[PDB]
RNA sequence: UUUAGAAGGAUUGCCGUCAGGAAAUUAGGUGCGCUUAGCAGUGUACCGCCGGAGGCGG
């Protein structure tokens, strides 16, 4: 998968990468993404 | 004070045609049922008498 790639980037990936986008660099964000966090209540939540 | 509190599933319909189950057989030898006993609520409810339903004599 494309994760495990990301993980240990083994070219084969960057390769690909690189060429059709040359912004590779923000896009390994898929990294460090921000955990969800509970912040409110309604009333469709039990 | 409940993974709290809410809810229309609904209308219609052609399953059909045909057909060889079949041949063979040894269920057999034994055997202690057996002590005791009272059928009935009285064995029936009969003649009359008053008296417009309820009563009284033998």
């Given at each position: 998968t494309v994760m495990?790639?990301?993980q240990?980037?083994?070219?084969e990936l960057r390769h690909?990468?690189?060429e059709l986008t040359?912004?590779?660099?923000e896009i390994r964000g898929i990294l460090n993404m921000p955990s969800m966090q509970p912040y409110?209540?309604?009333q469709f939540i039990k």
């Open positions: 495990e790639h990301l240990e980037d083994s070219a690909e990468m690189e040359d912004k590779y660099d409110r209540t309604n």
